[PDB]
Design a protein around this ligand. Structure first.
Ligand SMILES: CC[C@H]1C(=O)Nc2ccc(F)cc2N1C(=O)OC(C)C
Lengths: 400, 516
């Protein structure tokens, strides 16, 4: 059994990513885990000649009390040389499977191992902190799916032809299983699969729950439909309208802005003249559907922004070009951070399903906070790219 | 002996070939002795004239070899050490012994394949005569990888003894080695001599009982006992004239104290630095500056000790507002049995409010704690759940505070005002743009000078607040201003803002709206 020559992108060197400090609870887990992975030759302690580093974390699992080790190979994958059924999204149901353990059988190119260097920190720097490196294919590394693909196909080939009514899509450490069968039959069929895996030597990702892509409908823009309309209401109305005009340029306010004739009192109730009425209705009619002409191109990055609508409600939008939204949605139901993580994850899993790639996020949260608590609720095997921002005032208004 | 760590030169680069500068026959002599000794010990070895590499050597006697060229061409190693532990995190010990480790690097092999690059040359006194060539077999002092490799080794050398003596704690720091236990005075001293042997069996020589340093232990600006901790002596100068440099050095020093000496304040002093033109410029101390200094020297007059972490007991953090934008806090396990204390003066962003700031405090502390005790403390905060809750569920950014209990210790943080969620009925309506026009026919166009498109949008609003009654409705087009006020700040660097904030606090009701 020989390994596969893998190189970093030309000229690039290995990652030297700093290890965010961990809670002795997560550290203890990691220690127990890595000790074992060591006994089983999966990993090996490394010396000082390895200056590289990737962050590790410990996360919990659904339906299990066992800790899962997560390695932020985000940077490594970005320096790794290079090497999707539109039907998955159309399926009634999709269950996610963690097949990450598959890789722990295939050895990693001897000369690439040094790049998988990661560290288990120690509290209060009371000890140098254990350093390790991978021998087999690591979970979360962009290349493992690839290198293991071959074997993965041979392993699926059977169930594939036997159960052609299914759609098996793999991504990083996850396997997405799709079908339209009635949910009852589904859960039963998933099993036959995982044993057909035990057959070659596999956890439910998320819960033992299935996503239902068939109903991920885009949350359109809406306008307040109310009885009496006050000057303020009209102003808010026009404000939201003008904004939206950027997208649907068929929006006309002329008439509504006429009701705002002069310096009236905010609470004054304005009656809507026909000209205006037919204007809103029309404007209202345009927004019922997402704008035409917005197509996704693999060529570009997928961006995702989340807005806090408070009350436990959140709003997001996925686009590539501003205003040019590919999808938009909501999320409700715990503390802020817990929710946001659940959401990101939810939005990510969605992206993978629809476009087979993770989006780049913009999180309305101070970085130190995120860094501090995200692992406390994370459950996915992957990690999107993210950046932290300051949600403008109006953006939240115009949404939800 | 010990496993050799394989080294390599940076990719493409080749070994050094820098010539040996000239040397006094006096120095040649001395070096040849030093080197012949080093050759006897085996640390170095004579090499054939075919080795084209070379690193300079001069004398202090003491052989000093210039490895910067080699270092520049040597691979990067795993960082020798980011953080150092912090006293508040360590545990109480009955006995703590520091072990010096003489000639550490000299006792550690060097990747054989690398040795040829360590080649240096001893000039021949007689010029007709060619000098001797040597290369290292061990970690060369002054070489890039010596620290990292030495330490690495040390660990492996320690692992065993550590397993057999789990009831013993060892922390390696550079060339010092700290060993502590809770063994009776005598048993303790014996392990020390067991260990010393362990090290000696690896050629590592340590200081005799009669010679090792004895606590308190002066470490990284601290002063450690085996039961309590503090910071080394801290003396404030008594002086007539202060120079910015003096001022700066002083403030700097005072901060260091803040980590255990609560009540330290630098406000007035830091203030003396405004507009200064030179480090050597004398600045007279304001009355308040004098006051602050005196009070500080007072606090520093009495030593205060931090206690060590008892991982058996909970961590408790308590925070207080010690002035506008100023927070104090202290983490203890045993009621008021401080492990550590500290301040927080960071205002992130031009404007804010106590709620927002108090929370940012909590995040720093949370981060600090995880780093030190690997866990977060229960917080005791001068803010009521409701208050927080309210501000929380209305703020656009997300945030989360661990388990915390309200502490009625004034000043309690609160929000000095809130914008009506709805336009106000029967309240005059001001349309601003530099002036305003109201639904009730009033107007006040005022032209400001030395302004900004932004400070002007802010001005309008202000005027409006001023001239308006107890309840006002305000319509602005400035998204900017909107964001700021909408954020409900209670403090800002901008005076205008503070003028406005003041205004806002006064109103009975205020509704601010935006339009293009
Ligand atoms: C070795 C025991 C360890 C510890 O748990 N408590 C103490 C108490 C007093 C000391 F002087 C040292 C230390 N220790 C430590 O790691 O000291 C480094 C900061 C130098």
């Amino acid at each position: 059994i020989e390994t596969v020559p893998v190189k970093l992108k030309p000229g690039m060197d290995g990652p030297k990513v700093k290890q965010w400090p961990l809670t002795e609870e997560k550290i203890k887990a990691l220690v127990e885990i890595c000790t074992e992975m060591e006994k089983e030759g999966k990993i090996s302690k490394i010396g000082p000649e390895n200056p590289y580093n990737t962050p590790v974390f410990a996360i919990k699992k659904k339906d299990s009390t066992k800790w899962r080790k997560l390695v932020d190979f985000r940077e490594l994958n970005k320096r790794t040389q290079d090497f999707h059924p539109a039907g998955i999204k159309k399926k009634k149901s999709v269950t996610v499977l963690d097949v990450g353990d598959a890789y722990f059988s295939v050895p990693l190119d001897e000369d690439f191992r040094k790049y998988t260097a990661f560290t288990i920190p120690s509290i209060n720097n009371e000890t140098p902190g254990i350093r390790y490196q991978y021998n087999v294919l690591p979970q979360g590394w962009k290349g493992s799916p690839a290198i293991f693909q071959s074997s993965m196909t041979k392993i699926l080939e059977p169930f594939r032809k036997q159960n052609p009514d299914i759609v098996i899509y793999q991504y990083m450490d996850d396997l997405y299983v799709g079908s339209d069968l009635e949910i009852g039959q589904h859960r039963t069929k998933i099993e036959e699969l995982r044993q057909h895996l035990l057959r070659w030597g596999p956890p439910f990702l998320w819960m033992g729950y299935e996503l239902h892509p068939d109903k991920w409908t885009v949350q359109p823009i809406v306008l307040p439909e109310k009885d009496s309309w006050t000057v303020n209401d009209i102003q808010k109305l026009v404000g939201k309208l003008n904004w939206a005009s950027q997208i649907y340029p068929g929006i006309k306010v002329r008439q509504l802005c006429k009701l705002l004739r002069g310096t009236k009192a905010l609470t004054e109730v304005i009656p809507l003249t026909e000209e205006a009425e037919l204007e809103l209705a029309e404007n209202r009619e345009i927004l019922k559907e997402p704008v035409h002409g917005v197509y996704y191109d693999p060529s570009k990055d997928l961006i995702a922004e989340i807005q806090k609508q408070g009350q436990g409600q959140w709003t997001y939008q996925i686009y590539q070009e501003p205003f040019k939204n590919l999808k938009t949605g909501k999320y409700a139901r715990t503390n802020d951070v817990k929710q946001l993580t659940e959401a990101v994850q939810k939005i990510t899993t969605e992206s993978i399903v629809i476009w087979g790639k993770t989006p780049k996020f913009k999180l309305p949260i101070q970085k130190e906070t995120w860094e501090t608590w995200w692992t406390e609720y994370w459950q996915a095997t992957w990690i999107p790219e993210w950046e932290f921002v300051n949600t403008p005032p109006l953006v939240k208004l115009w949404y939800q | 002996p010990i496993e050799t760590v394989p080294v390599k030169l940076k990719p493409g680069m080749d070994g050094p070939k820098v010539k040996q500068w000239p040397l006094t026959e006096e120095k040649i002599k001395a070096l040849v002795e030093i080197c012949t000794e080093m050759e006897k010990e085996g640390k170095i070895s004579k090499i054939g004239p075919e080795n084209p590499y070379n690193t300079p050597v001069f004398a202090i006697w003491r052989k000093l070899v210039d490895f910067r060229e080699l270092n520049k061409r040597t691979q990067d190693f795993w960082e020798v050490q980011l953080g150092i532990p912090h006293p508040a995190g360590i545990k109480k010990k009955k006995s703590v012994t520091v072990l010096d480790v003489g000639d550490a690097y000299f006792s550690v092999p060097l990747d054989e394949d690398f040795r040829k690059y360590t080649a240096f040359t001893i000039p021949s006194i007689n010029n007709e005569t060619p000098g001797i060539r040597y290369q290292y077999n061990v970690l060369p002092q002054g070489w890039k990888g010596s620290p990292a490799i030495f330490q690495s080794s040390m660990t492996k050398i320690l692992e065993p003894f550590r397993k057999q003596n789990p009831d013993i704690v060892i922390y390696q720091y550079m060339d010092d080695l700290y060993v502590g236990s809770d063994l009776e005075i005598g048993q303790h001293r014996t392990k020390i001599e067991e260990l010393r042997q362990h090290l000696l069996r690896w050629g590592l020589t340590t200081p005799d009982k009669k010679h090792q340093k004895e606590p308190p232990f002066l470490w990284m600006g601290y002063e450690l006992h085996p039961d309590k901790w503090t910071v080394q002596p801290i003396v404030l100068p008594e002086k007539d004239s202060w120079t910015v440099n003096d001022i700066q050095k002083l403030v700097g020093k005072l901060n260091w104290a803040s980590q255990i000496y609560p009540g330290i304040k630098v406000r007035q002093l830091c203030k003396l630095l405004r507009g200064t033109k030179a480090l050597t410029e004398v600045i007279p101390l304001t009355e308040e500056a004098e006051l602050e200094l005196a009070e500080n020297r007072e606090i520093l007059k009495e030593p205060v000790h931090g206690v060590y972490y008892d991982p058996s007991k909970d961590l408790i953090a308590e925070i207080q507002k010690q002035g506008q934008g100023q927070w104090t806090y202290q983490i203890y396990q045993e009621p008021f049995k401080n492990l550590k204390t500290g301040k927080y003066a960071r205002m992130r962003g031009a404007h804010t409010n106590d709620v927002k700031q108090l929370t940012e405090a909590v995040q720093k502390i949370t981060t600090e704690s995880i780093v030190i005790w690997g866990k977060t403390p229960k917080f005791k905060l001068p803010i009521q759940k409701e208050t927080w809750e309210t501000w929380w569920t209305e703020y656009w950014q997300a945030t989360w505070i661990p388990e915390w209990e309200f502490v009625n210790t004034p000043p309690l943080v609160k929000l000095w005002y809130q914008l009506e969620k709805e336009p106000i009925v029967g309240a005059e309506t001001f349309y601003v743009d530099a002036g305003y026009v109201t639904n009730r026919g009033r107007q006040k166009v005022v032209t400001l000078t030395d302004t900004t498109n932004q400070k002007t949008e802010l001005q309008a609003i202000y005027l409006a607040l001023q001239d308006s009654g107890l309840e006002v409705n305000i319509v602005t087009d400035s998204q900017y201003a909107l964001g700021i006020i909408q954020a409900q700040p209670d403090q800002s660097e901008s005076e205008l803002v503070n003028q406005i904030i003041e205004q806002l606090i006064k109103k009975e009701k205020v509704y601010l709206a935006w339009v293009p």
